[PDB]
Amino acid sequence: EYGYIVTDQKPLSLAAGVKLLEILAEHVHMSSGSFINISVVGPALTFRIRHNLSLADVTQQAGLVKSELEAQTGLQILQTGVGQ
Amino acid sequence: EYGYIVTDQKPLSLAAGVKLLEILAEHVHMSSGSFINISVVGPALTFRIRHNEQNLSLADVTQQAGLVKSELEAQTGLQILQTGVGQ
Ligand SMILES: [Ca+2]
């Protein structure tokens, strides 16, 4: 399983994807280095989480703070979820 | 915003989509009629959730759909590839 965030960026930069994860990490009180196996592919950011909070927790939290994520990164978040 | 379930069936049938919802509803102890504004688009099912006695959320029901993906797959033959919330 992996977490993902689909943005409006065509394509999403690696720098902006990591910025999303830094902000997300802060909101869940985890080190951003606990986001592992990160990739950007087209508009999407994908990631897993290291031993430390679950993917469910973090994608739920990404919804909770979506406004803040969008304002700080200058992009729009179109989907957040879990894949496998 | 909408909840969604992405399958490996393109086009996904409406009837199969709502069978997914019936299994999910049984698992979360909600009436399936509390899934509203339903559509199928490509391989995906999209929906919202009505006021319900259980006070359940989108992340809540889409999290659950991911947990019971083996059961959704066993019962319907679909493969569940993604679950999430969209805008
Ligand atoms: Ca937005």
Curated annotation (Swiss-Prot), chain B:
Changing G84D: Impairs normal processing and leads to retention in the endoplasmic reticulum and degradation. Glycans are attached at N37, N55. It is found in: Cytoplasmic vesicle, Secretory vesicle membrane. Residues 1-87 are annotated as: Sufficient for dimerization of proICA512. ICA512-TMF regulates dynamics and exocytosis of insulin secretory granules (SGs); binding of ICA512-TMF to SNTB2/beta-2-syntrophin is proposed to restrain SGs mobility and exocytosis by tethering them to the actin cytoskeleton depending on UTRN; the function is inhibited by cytoplasmic ICA512-CFF dimerizing with ICA512-TMF and displacing SNTB2. This is ICA512-transmembrane fragment.
